[PDB]
Amino acid sequence: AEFNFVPLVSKVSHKETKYRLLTKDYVSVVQPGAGLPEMLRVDPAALTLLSSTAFDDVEHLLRSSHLMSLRKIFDDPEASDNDKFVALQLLKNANISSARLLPGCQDTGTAIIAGYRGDQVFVPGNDEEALSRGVYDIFQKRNFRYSQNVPLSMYDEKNTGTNLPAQIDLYASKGMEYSFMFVAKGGGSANKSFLLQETKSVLNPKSLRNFLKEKLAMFGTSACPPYHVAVVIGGTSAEMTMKVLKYASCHYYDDLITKPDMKTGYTFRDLELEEEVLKVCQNIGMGAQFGGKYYAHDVRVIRMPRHGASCPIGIGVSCSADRQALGKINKDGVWLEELEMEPSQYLPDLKEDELLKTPAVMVNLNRPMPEVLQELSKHPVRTRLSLTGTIIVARDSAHARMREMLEAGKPLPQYMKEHPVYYAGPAKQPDGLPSGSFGPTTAGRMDPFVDLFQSHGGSMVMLAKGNRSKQVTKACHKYGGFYLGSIGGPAAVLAQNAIKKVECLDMKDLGMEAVWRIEVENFPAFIVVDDKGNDFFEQL
Amino acid sequence: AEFNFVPLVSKVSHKETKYRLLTKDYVSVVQPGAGLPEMLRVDPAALTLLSSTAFDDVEHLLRSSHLMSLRKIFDDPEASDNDKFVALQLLKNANISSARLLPGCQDTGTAIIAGYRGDQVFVPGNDEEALSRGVYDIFQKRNFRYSQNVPLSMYDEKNTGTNLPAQIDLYASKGMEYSFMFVAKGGGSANKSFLLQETKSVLNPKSLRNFLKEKLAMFGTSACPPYHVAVVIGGTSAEMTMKVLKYASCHYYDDLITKPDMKTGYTFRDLELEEEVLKVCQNIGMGAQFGGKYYAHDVRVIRMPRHGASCPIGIGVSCSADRQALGKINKDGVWLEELEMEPSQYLPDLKEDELLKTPAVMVNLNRPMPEVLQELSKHPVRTRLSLTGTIIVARDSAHARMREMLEAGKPLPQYMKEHPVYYAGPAKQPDGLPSGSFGPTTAGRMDPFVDLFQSHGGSMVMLAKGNRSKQVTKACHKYGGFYLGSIGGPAAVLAQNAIKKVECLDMKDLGMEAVWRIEVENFPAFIVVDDKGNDFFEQL
Ligand SMILES: O=C(O)C[C@H](S)C(=O)O
Ligand SMILES: O=C(O)C[C@H](S)C(=O)O
Ligand code: SF4
Ligand code: SF4
């Protein structure tokens, strides 16, 4: 018929989003000549202030709705004891990080910025560079982590030492506002954004539920649940499906129409599938990292148009580092989403000593490794532990380099054969404090090194977060080693309560990915893989 | 560690891109008051004309470099005979479609538009709506296909009848130019954009070579090779990796720095890996759809920075419908990339009879199917055929609706048991011509219907394009049916030379996805799966 323009996705409000005013500075309304409307001149320093403040706030603060979801776990009669134990560490973590000495997570993430500059906004300068200065500034000032590696070739890399580059996308809109979304996206949650190339034949109730049942297990516990799950069914391209997925997991689309109207847009939020997806998450068994009901806080499902030959599907999560802030600049100043500044009020009234039936088994790590293995071998998987002593810290790059050494005929470093290995990379150490945020790394990315290193007598006791592949279960059964699982997410509580001394041992060029040697007291862990073929997550 | 702004990706030239002028209309330079620089006013009709013209051209024309890669196949002593037979049909196809009666492919694709509106460009109107109108206008005027389905619910859908919505992304840049890239992205090549979530442990020559060998086979022949292959190693997010991959497969990044410089950007184009990837593709055995060397015309490899914990990898293809155009609007007018206006000069001087040594086997389809199955059963896979008679046409939505029928206790439609099945959806029929572009659709998306339908006596002889799953070998072996493969891509040659009558038989609500009944004469096809467990592609 006739031309009726309807956008692919309609414009969306954010009615539950409260903004705090940063300043009425930097902004002036001018009346240009020609046939032009009035314009909003914005000084570039306004962009620097907003991006630095926003990342300051998302690295230390959380949304009230998100904290409220963690607190609801304690009242739920169907939540497991481990669900509640995990949620409480994550609530204590928020209380600690609101003081702004320690960020919530050791991975202060990738800085993602999306701005929408209306045609009536004029900025006399370079937008990306002004936003990058704010990112640079705040990561320099706060006790954050430099996590970005730029390539010097295909295979050689260098940490930039500043957490740049930021990913900045500036879009052209209409009107007299500069709107923004800031995201501090952790790497492990970013690794769990998946694109599934599907077809029309999955687009029926029976097929889609069998599909989603299977695919939702792909996150595992590797992205620190409880999750904010998002699903995008359809899309006009793989890059559009994945962009919308990013937005949906940031809850950017909560106010989108929930029924097609063929008027304001072609894309809608499907409340019915969201409830079905939530139930599958509540029945998946993994719960909040160590068994239970709270795989997911909540779910977002967005249905887009598609080419007849296509049905791209996106699934992804926001992790327990749920870090995003809306912002905007208009003729009334610089505005930033208000996050929760009194997170202590979401802490439940209870003694943590009363949440868990059995007390932790205490393991002295400052023993000969055969002794430590002997003590661990007395306990079945699911056994909660409390660890005290020296630990060697190494993750992706240090493991990659040791594999090169082995392949060159060089021995595995001896410190790998004498201590447990904790996969982690610390954020910067605050003045006068024993440790920066120092939580655990995804254990599955190190699975290709386990059999290799244990065949050299190393990596016999591993401490990290997330479930692992069956090859690690077989390797530990083959050589008699252990995978100890930690709670992922509460890096500030660990830095404050458990990590007593931090030294850089080896591979110092790798920044945060260097080999560290740390002293811990009462570090919490569960036995996840034992020396007999048993895996926590294969049982239930 | 001083602040040194370096973009994620540098700005890129397009030095091999010649632009033709459409008009000096619609643009005026004005000098506004205040402290504002001179501005360029662009009438919204300029965006309508540019988008209308760009899509007119990409649907009918190709880049000269692309035609030359096809023509280079004929002088290559290592090109297979089928490589050349395929290349020749695609060269004839380009010659036909340059008349603008028939588009190169029946799938005129998803309309993708990316714009860069400079700070000094003002459009007194709605850019997105003006670009969609040009898309609307040209799909109405030319004999294109309406391919877009908007949801009425999660599972109910409707074709829009216009090929809207377009995917429009407008970025805010600086300066006095409005730059564009227009892409008509086929559904089948878009389905072969894959996101692989990898880690640092793949980032070594041996692992990355093992990884790429395995993953490059994922395209198969389902996206109508020879491909323009693109690979992106790294990226700051999944949506960025997939965005950059789209551009790289459009050859947008051809002028990118080929070595890191730590100044203009952090991303570079890796010529040494492009050379390794091309060799893997030349040795992969699938060739240009039916065995040979020309799986790939060429290769692009982009290396991006990454979070320490992440290595997203994108792989994708431009299909035989390699459809993109750069454009721009400035103070000197409306510009559009010049595509090849005389493709006939790229046809080799050779008789098509001289290319293949064994003649095609002629199969009369106007017989009882047991006769046709007996005739086809005389021949092994790879046997070239030439088919004449009646064929039923049905693909995705029509199969899904017949699967609904069977589960309800409704019989498989009788026409499915009486004729060969052609998976295809036609573009609009030109006035006074027997058929619109009417090439084949990807056969693998119908694999879930094969065993089901043959168990009801239907779909015994299938005609489509691309390799299929092992469950189709077993179903044809179980029930005694055949999958005959055709060359994908040259939909205009088929409409001109092979398709003699077209009728809509059933399911007319589904538009191009309705069930059709066509008469073909000398339609070429190869036996790809027979009634004995043999697969063309399981034997190289
Ligand atoms: O880099 C880290 O510290 C942890 C990352 S965010 C992860 O694996 O989830
Ligand atoms: O939709 C079509 O006509 C064919 C698509 S592009 C495909 O399967 O390749
Ligand atoms: S909460 Fe877990 S997944 Fe998220 S950034 Fe922190 S360690 Fe990574
Ligand atoms: S050339 Fe093949 S893959 Fe590309 S749009 Fe046409 S039918 Fe689809």
Short mmCIF file of C-alpha atoms in Angstrom, two decimals, chain A residues 11 78 175 226 264 325 388 414 421 431 442 472 502 524:
data_model
loop_
_atom_site.label_atom_id
_atom_site.label_comp_id
_atom_site.label_asym_id
_atom_site.label_seq_id
_atom_site.Cartn_x
_atom_site.Cartn_y
_atom_site.Cartn_z
CA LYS A 11 11.34 5.36 20.96
CA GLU A 78 12.05 -21.81 47.89
CA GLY A 175 16.02 17.65 19.31
CA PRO A 226 21.81 -14.34 39.90
CA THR A 264 5.06 3.40 16.93
CA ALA A 325 23.67 4.54 34.17
CA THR A 388 43.97 -20.06 55.20
CA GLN A 414 57.97 -24.50 40.73
CA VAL A 421 46.37 -21.62 42.05
CA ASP A 431 46.36 3.50 49.94
CA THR A 442 35.97 -17.73 35.20
CA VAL A 472 38.75 -31.13 34.00
CA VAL A 502 49.54 -9.32 48.07
CA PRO A 524 35.40 -19.38 51.44
#
